[PDB]
Amino acid sequence: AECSVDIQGNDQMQFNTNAITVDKSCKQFTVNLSHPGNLPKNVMGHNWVLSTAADMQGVVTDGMASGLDKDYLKPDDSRVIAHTKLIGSGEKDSVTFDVSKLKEGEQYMFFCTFPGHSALMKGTLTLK
Amino acid sequence: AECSVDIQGNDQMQFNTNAITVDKSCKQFTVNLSHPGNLPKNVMGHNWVLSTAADMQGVVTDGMASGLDKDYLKPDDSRVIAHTKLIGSGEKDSVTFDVSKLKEGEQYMFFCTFPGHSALMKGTLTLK
Amino acid sequence: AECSVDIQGNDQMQFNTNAITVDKSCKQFTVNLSHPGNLPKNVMGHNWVLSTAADMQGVVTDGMASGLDKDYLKPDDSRVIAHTKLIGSGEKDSVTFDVSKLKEGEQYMFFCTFPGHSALMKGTLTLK
Amino acid sequence: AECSVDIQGNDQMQFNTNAITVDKSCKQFTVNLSHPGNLPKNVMGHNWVLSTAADMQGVVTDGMASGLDKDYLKPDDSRVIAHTKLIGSGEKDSVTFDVSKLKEGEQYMFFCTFPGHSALMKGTLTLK
Ligand SMILES: [Cu+2]
Ligand SMILES: [Cu+2]
Ligand SMILES: [Cu+2]
Ligand SMILES: [Cu+2]
């Protein structure tokens, strides 16, 4: 903890948390994502992507259209504040982003953009 | 035919389609919604609401807040392009709207605003 | 219609129906499955598999263990009343089964066995 | 904590955990469910129900058909190992059950039976 959180995406298309809080004193924040399941990336890949709650749907829709090879994210999507790579069973990836990119009193969402996963794999992030 | 679509929302909280293409030649377009289930409106009510993808989240959140009596939609919400009433088991409702309200290049989303249903009851609509 | 149904599974990991009624006057019933999406079989393949509600979990878990080469279905699983092949984008398949293999008073479920899909891709089949 | 777990069901149809482990040395185990949301029971009611993974579908289908007044659970359902009542905003309920009712090498699932919630509100319970 302290300017970091560890999150897991499993073979049941679930993240193990629905809410992340970022302490306003952190200059940067790190998310460390792992996949504890046994299914591969092409079947059950997960990423953790952060955007405003208003932008989540356009990011998910354009992410599906970019496809597989682009980790289901539009290249240089300006609405994505930070994201990991798409990972499979046994893998891990971290992303560190500057907390100054987040406003107090704005709602943010984290989600996975693998096709169909965002319906269940999503949660809120808020500054504290 | 052609400028209309029949959509069902059932007791599994799912629509029977997640993509609607509106033909550029239609002067108007009709959505015919029915609820083939057995559950009452106060527990599994569904409506079909249209907005841009960017506005979806605000419409769902203010909708949730307006309550069952307002069909979970903010009264006179300017972000709502077109909508049906909230219907329960065995009911039907239709909405016809002007296609000039849509423009090519914009991403639209249709969804249900009953609390929690948009997680699964959502789809894209595009003018082609 | 009546002694056959057309079903589709899409890129949003959803079937277009979650309840099928088989008329007792049908001696045989045909299910025609299509995949109207763009994702390939190994990422978003779908099949239509029928069993009793009590055997669905067993069929899904062992199906998952059999892998893609087995269309995610255990070879000669006796709990499966009928099934299609696993199809990907733009493919289709059909299966016909005898209605006397069904009895009134028993709960049946149709579902997809591609890993993770059964949570949303499932529905009831009832003999009426 | 020791032989007990605290779990929350929110307005986004999410449990705050998706995996419960019960230690074999516990003579009994307690689940304390709360609803930190603002939506009422008819809209977003949640309960915690435990059965084998095999029986979950039967419990969910029959639960749906029992009605709001029956807390969407079939009265005296033999397949339910333990359950809470259906609670709404600001409510709380607990269930303590005998760990002798669980056997090793059997898969258990906990889920909510409010219509449409089990697709998202479900997790595994394991005896170690
Ligand atoms: Cu994912
Ligand atoms: Cu709805
Ligand atoms: Cu599938
Ligand atoms: Cu619930």
Curated annotation (Swiss-Prot), chains A, B, C, D:
Q: In the record, what terms sit under GO molecular function? A: copper ion binding; electron transfer activity; identical protein binding; transition metal ion binding; zinc ion binding
Q: Name one Pfam family in it.
A: Copper-bind
List where in the cell it is found.
Periplasm
Residues at which Cu cation binds: 46, 112, 117, 121
Q: Where is the Plastocyanin-like domain?
A: 1-128
Disulfide bond positions? 3-26
Please give the CDD domains that the UniProt record associates with this protein.
Azurin
Do the record's keywords include Secreted?
no
Q: Gene Ontology cellular component?
A: periplasmic space; plasma membrane
Entry keyword set: Copper, Disulfide bond, Electron transport, Metal-binding, Periplasm, Signal, Transport
| Principal subcellular localization | periplasm
Tell me the PROSITE patterns matching this sequence: COPPER_BLUE
Keyword rRNA processing belongs to the record: no
Question: What the protein does?
Answer: Transfers electrons from cytochrome c551 to cytochrome oxidase.
Q: What is this protein called?
A: Azurin
Can you name the source organism? Pseudomonas aeruginosa (strain ATCC 15692 / DSM 22644 / CIP 104116 / JCM 14847 / LMG 12228 / 1C / PRS 101 / PAO1)
